[PDB]
């Protein structure tokens, strides 16, 4: 199987120079929180290289922000590892609802709960209720996608190609890091800016590209397999067709930027809101490219 020639018109924003430092801080954070990983889990985390993804997503971030975001990613990888109990819908329901309660303020218990509480304290405090509402929405949506997949698998139900794309937006967990971008970029989006049709299209296309690129570079429901199912093709035919669909998503990023600039000028958007939206127009390209260089390279 040969990967296709991807359509990548987005230039690179670089890689953070503190990649080695933020990895050492990530494992130093896991040890201080009592996160006891098994040997296969430790090998899996080293193989996944969370320091690489976070450094390609936030190359200009401060070291403190990069370390914090990396520990979120380190925590999210540990959450994903446990759910692939992980298939029993009754276990997933109690596990997810416990993590969300800890997020909402319930006193933590285990190491994963105290780690999440510490992550939420360092991140969510100081941010606006506008940001905390979107951050919880994206984080909780990602957590409940494990319950959704568990119940869907237990019922013998399979997702269509369209339903999986909507589900993949929350299950790729790129959106919670689009909220973290606001922190490292020094911006804050009002709900009016979040309601702009072109910003929604831009935020979703950035999320879709990350999800599909993930499935392509990783041979669980996979978009390439669903293409192979809905088209009855071989693996190489489904991989190239998946790459073509990714090219359309990259095209959606370009059209959403143009339409967002048009919506800024037409609506008379100025001040910090215009600065926050123009920051996303400039940065979301490098996020797509940074995520792409992680999965493909
Ligand atoms: Ca184009």
Protein structure class: mainly alpha
Q: What is the distance, rounded to the nearest whole angstrom, between the alpha carbons of the first and last residues? A: 16 Å
Beta percentage is: under 5%
What is the N-to-C order of secondary-structure elements (H for helix, E for strand)? HHHHHHHHHHHHHH
Bound molecules: calcium ion
Oligomeric organization of the protein chains:
monomer
CATH superfamily annotation of the domain at 158-297 = Farnesyl Diphosphate Synthase
H/I helix tally: 14
| Molecular shape | globular
Rg for CA atoms: 19 Å
Largest sheet: none
- Helical content band: over 70%
The CATH class of the domain at 158-297 is identified as: Mainly Alpha
**Could you tell me the number of beta strands?**
0
Return the CATH topology of the domain at 158-297: Farnesyl Diphosphate Synthase
Corresponding CATH architecture of the domain at 158-297: Orthogonal Bundle
Give the secondary structure arrangement, pairings included.
Blueprint: H1 19-32, H2 39-48, H3 50-57, H4 63-82, H5 89-104, H6 111-124, H7 129-154, H8 161-171, H9 175-185, H10 191-194, H11 197-216, H12 223-231, H13 235-266, H14 271-296
Helix pairs in contact: 1-3, 1-4, 3-4, 3-14, 4-6, 5-6, 5-7, 7-8, 7-9, 8-11, 11-13, 11-14, 12-13, 13-14
Bound molecules: calcium ion.
Calcium ion is lined by residues 9, 251, 254.
